[PDB]
Amino acid sequence: HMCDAFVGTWKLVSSENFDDYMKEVGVGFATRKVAGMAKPNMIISVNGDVITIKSESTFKNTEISFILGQEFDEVTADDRKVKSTITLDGGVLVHVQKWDGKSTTIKRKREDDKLVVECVMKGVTSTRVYERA
Numbered sequence: 001h002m003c004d005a006f007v008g009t010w011k012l013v014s015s016e017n018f019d020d021y022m023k024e025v026g027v028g029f030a031t032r033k034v035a036g037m038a039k040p041n042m043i044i045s046v047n048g049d050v051i052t053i054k055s056e057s058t059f060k061n062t063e064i065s066f067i068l069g070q071e072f073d074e075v076t077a078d079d080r081k082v083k084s085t086i087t088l089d090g091g092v093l094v095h096v097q098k099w100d101g102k103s104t105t106i107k108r109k110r111e112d113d114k115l116v117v118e119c120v121m122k123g124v125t126s127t128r129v130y131e132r133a
């Protein structure tokens with residue numbers, strides 16, 4: 001219901017430093033190059049306490065469905081198996097992924113008519129902006 005403001009279909013309109021963020025995370029060259037090209041839609045829906053986030057692109061389609069604060073297993077777009085927890089803190093969806101002893105955090109926030117996705121690995125940050133389809 002505050003989560004309401006995220007629901008919808010959001011198309012990528014800009015990206016900054018995503019290749020460097022992916023490098024830091026450990027994504028391989030072929031997947032960086034092809035994923036980097038893509039123009040994914042991020043589709044967010046809610047049904048009760050279950051939130052679903054889908055990403056659809058020419059590269060890969062991904063889907064997670066989860067309850068806030070309850071850890072789950074995820075397969076990332078670059079085919080890594082991680083343990084994820086998503087919480088809603090001060091209005092921002094905060095997605096933490098843990099794998100192989102590492103961690104990254106992906107934040108989704110509403111800013112004006114945009115959905116802004118900030119990805120952080122160590123000190124490398126990427127910002128991706130999406131707008132309503």
Ligand SMILES: Cc1c(Cc2ccccc2)nc(C(C)(C)C)c(-c2nnn[nH]2)c1-c1ccccc1
Nearest residue numbers: 025035038040055057059060076077078106119
């Ligand atoms: C490859 C990839 C990664 C890699 C990665 C995953 C997990 C942690 C760190 C890196 N990450 C993302 C996030 C969630 C982080 C932005 C996307 C992505 N962009 N739009 N929707 N999904 C894609 C992606 C998916 C389809 C098409 C293009 C890009």
